[PDB]
Every structure is written in C-alpha cells, then in structure tokens.
Amino acid sequence: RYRLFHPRREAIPMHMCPAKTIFPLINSNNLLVKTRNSWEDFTGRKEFDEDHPLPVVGSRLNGRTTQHKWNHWDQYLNPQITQSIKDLTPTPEYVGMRCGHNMIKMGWMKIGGSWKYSRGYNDRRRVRFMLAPRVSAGG
Amino acid sequence: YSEARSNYDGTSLPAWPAPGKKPTYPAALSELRLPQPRMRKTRTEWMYYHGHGGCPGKYGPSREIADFEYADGTPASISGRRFAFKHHQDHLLVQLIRAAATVERYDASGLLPRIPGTAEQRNWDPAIPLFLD
Amino acid sequence: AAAIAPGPYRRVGNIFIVHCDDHPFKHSWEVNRMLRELRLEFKGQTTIVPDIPQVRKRIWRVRHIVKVDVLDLDEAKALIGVPEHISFTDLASQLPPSFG
Amino acid sequence: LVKRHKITNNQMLLMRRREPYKPTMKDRQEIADRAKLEEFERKNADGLMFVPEKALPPWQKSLAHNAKALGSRINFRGFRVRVADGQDEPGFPTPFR
C-alpha cells in the first residue's frame, strides 16, 4: 500500500534532535541558544587531534585549478612582477571577443549548434507618421 | 567501540520485561480511525513507528551515528552534509518553536476564535454545530 | 472528584504537522500557492505550522494533498523535552532572527 | 528550445511548469489588470490636481509660457490666457480646485 496511515509526529521524529541541541542549558533554567543558523555558515572540516590530520584528498573544485596569472592588483602592489607583455593585460571589464550568437528569442547560444529554432536571427542578420500632419514646410 | 542509540540522551524504553511476565506488543493494525478496513502495518509504517522516517537512511541511528571512528577513540570530522543535516534538524525545531510562539501570541492578543473552524469550513461541513447567538 | 477542575485555568493552543502526500504540481495553481504558503513544494515534505484561522483555511483548501497531525502545546513541549515553566515565546525571543 | 534545468529529485523530472505556484498566462493577465486598475483608482481617489505651468509636460509648458509671456513681463493681476493644450476640466469639485 502507498496509502499509509501513520502520525506525522512519527513522519518527523524529534527523538535524536531534542530542544537541548539548540538550548543546551535549558534543563538548568538557562536559555542560551547555540543553533547552526544555515548551511551557508560552514567554515569547513577541522581535525579533532594533531595525531589524526585529515587526508588531502583532491576535489574537483580545488584540483581542477590553473596557475595564477598576475592580476592588476598584484601588479600594482608589486611592480617587480610586471615582467612581460603577457602580464600587461587589458582592463578586467573586457571579457573577450564575443562567442556564440545572440539569437532573438533564446538569448546567447553556443556556436556548437541548435540553429533549427532560430529564424528571426537570420532575418535580422540579412541586413504613425502618415497620420500626423506637417506643421510647416520645413517642419 | 560500537554504538547503538535510539534517543539523543541514549535512554531507551524497557525492552525486556520481568521474567515470566507477558510482554507488551505494538499495534500491528494500521492507525486508521475507522475499524474497517482492518489492515496490518506496512514495512514503511513499521519504520515510521520505530523511528526511521519511512526510509533506513533518513532519520534514526543509521543517520545520526558516525559510520566510523579511529581505533584509539578519536571521532570523525564534521562533513558538510553532516552540518547541513544538523542545520535541518535545528530548522525543524525552529519551525516548531515559532509556530508555538505564534499560537501563544495569538491567544494572548485574543485572536484565536472561539468557533471551531473558518467560515468556509463551517458552511461546507454539517458536523460543526451552529454557533449563532 | 466528579467536579470542575478547582483552580486557575490556562488556554492551550494546537500545532499542525502537515505532510504533503500527493505531487503538488499536478493540481491547479491555487492549490500549489496554498501549499507553498504552507511551505510545501514536493511530495514527502513535512512542515510545522500554528493552529490559526489562516493556516486552517489553507489546510482546508489543500486537504486532499495534505495529511495533518495535531499537537497541543503541552504535547509539543513534551516532544521537544523542555521544562513546563519555560515558554515557547521565550524560546522564540531567544532564537536568532536570521536563522534561515 | 525548452529551457532545461538541473534537477534535484525525480519530482523535478515529473514537474511540467517550472513554477507551479504561479498563475497561468491568462490568470496572470487578469491579476495584472486588476492590480493596475486598483492602483489607478487609488491614485485618482483624490481629485485631478491643477498643476501649475512649470509642472506641465514638456510639450505644454513652453506653449503656455509663450502664451502668457506678455503678462509675465508686464505685471498685473487678472491676466489669464485661455490656452487649448492645458489640462482638461474634470467635471466635479475637488480639494485642489
């Protein structure tokens, strides 16, 4: 059966998350709140002991990373690093030469494909007053 | 070494009665109000009854007890998902507390009507008597 | 003693645990809006809400997608395990406002 | 094309409308029209204020100023030019009238 008749207090059990989790001192007439506000507030894993350091296991967010190319702040702070025309980079506002196509009804589409649903784009690529009177000959 | 907890405090209801005493048993029948249909509890209903939120991996010891521990007793680290689950439990607690506080504040202000239901429910359901006066 | 409780009387409210049991998106947008007001968007989601006329109106509107459980304030206090003298108003005032 | 979205559960696969709690197109038009009408009625709850010359739109301000230019340079009360582009008469008394 997919029609289960059980209390929703059972559906959401509060057995292993009592009030003491957030008000640890509640049982002793002390209303101190220590509640983990949001998942956003997570400083990261921390070793419990110095003898058991966490392993440095590569993740894709910190491993798939390229070498640092001096930015404007670094070159302004220490001019000794502006050692090449390559280091002489343009303003950061310049993303680069435009890629993709600004199709009318779909926005920016990759140059890869998906051209079937775009005809107004090609129409624009291939490139009331009568009811109002003239106040004077010269306008 | 190993751990087996059903409650946050680790306390558990007496499972084994005194010798020679007739042991207590759960309610095998579903919690349906009507006497019929007389259906036995499903496996998922038993999971709900025993504390797991319908699934083995949602709530209960299988979700709250660390899956490993160093041989010398040093505990495990706080994973991001572990912190997120703790935040979710705190969020459930906060929802409950805020709902209770809202009910109490409404009662104090005097907004909780003495009538059982709203106008729509009252004019839809005959079971609610007439409170005209 | 076969007589009315001889002492000061305190009013106690209720709290509704609302669980979504049917795909909310398969209904009309009014039902989905009421469910979202109840803070429900997917099947299998459970929320805790106060027993007030607005919440009752919403639950009445979406009673065919929602299964409801009741918990008096006393029952909720016992469930969370806090002293009876402490008030949910005090707990709410203590807990932070920028939680989620 | 159809805007594909990253899923977080099979419920999102079953979902057809990205925002189920949002009125359909016709109901959106109805609600927007009702809201705009209510806002317009709230704005017009008070009478039609007769704004001065300087507050008229750009295409009436200069015409009125030129019409009343002579009176501005020769100051004497009681001089009013009955221009045509001015604000239309409301038809009822108003607090600002």
């Binding site: 070793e47 | 997120a84 969020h91 | 997917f42 | -």
Partner: peptide, 28 residues
C-alpha cells in the same frame, strides 16, 4: 523559482571550507 528549504538540503561546497592548517611556532 524560489527555495523554501523545507526539506533537507546538502550544503554547497565553497572555497571558504578549506581545511586551514593552524599556524605553528618554529621548531628552533
């Protein structure tokens, strides 16, 4: 859409979660 977080949500991985090694006084 808008998220209510009424159900369990896995915290998103972010660079601020890097395990920072605590500064240690030199051995000399």
């Amino acid at each position: 859409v808008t998220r209510l977080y009424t159900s369990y949500y896995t915290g998103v991985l972010y660079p601020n979660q890097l395990v920072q090694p605590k500064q240690r006084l030199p051995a000399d």
